Amino acid sequence: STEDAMTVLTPLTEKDYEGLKRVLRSLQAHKMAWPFLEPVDPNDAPDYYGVIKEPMDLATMEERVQRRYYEKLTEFVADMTKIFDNCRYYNPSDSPFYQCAEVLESFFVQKLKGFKASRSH
Ligand SMILES: Cn1cnc(Nc2ccc(CCN)cc2)c(Cl)c1=O
Numbered sequence: 001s002t003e004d005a006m007t008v009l010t011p012l013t014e015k016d017y018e019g020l021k022r023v024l025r026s027l028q029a030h031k032m033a034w035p036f037l038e039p040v041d042p043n044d045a046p047d048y049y050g051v052i053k054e055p056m057d058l059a060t061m062e063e064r065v066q067r068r069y070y071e072k073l074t075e076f077v078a079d080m081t082k083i084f085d086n087c088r089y090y091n092p093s094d095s096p097f098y099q100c101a102e103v104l105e106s107f108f109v110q111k112l113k114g115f116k117a118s119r120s121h
Pocket of ligand 1: 034035036038039040041044045048087090091097
């Protein structure tokens with residue numbers, strides 16, 4: 001679709017980055033975002049960094065958004081998707097972390113669809 005190819009192909013502008021920061025800020029303020037605000041503490045999960053290849057967290061993405069790290073929206077979505085995929089990979093489905101990744105990813109998808117619609121019209 002128009003938004004699909006534009007997500008893959010259209011380079012991010014300074015205007016887009018205003019939308020990326022807003023989406024991220026709305027995630028950081030969500031009540032179920034508490035496990036993803038900062039990197040996982042390895043004292044809380046000893047084997048986490050031995051099994052998770054590419055860890056990710058909202059503070060790392062905030063730094064990358066600040067430094068204009070992302071060139072395409074797909075790269076931004078890929079980093080965010082890693083946060084939730086890493087969580088559901090390491091934790092059981094009845095874990096509070098797992099449940100948070102399910103709620104927050106749905107919330108992110110709602111906000112991402114709003115951002116994609118604002119770039120095209
Ligand atoms: C297994 N596992 C553990 N903790 C997670 N988040 C998280 C990050 C930081 C803090 C407090 C910071 N000292 C608490 C929880 C995730 Cl996401 C996870 O999967």
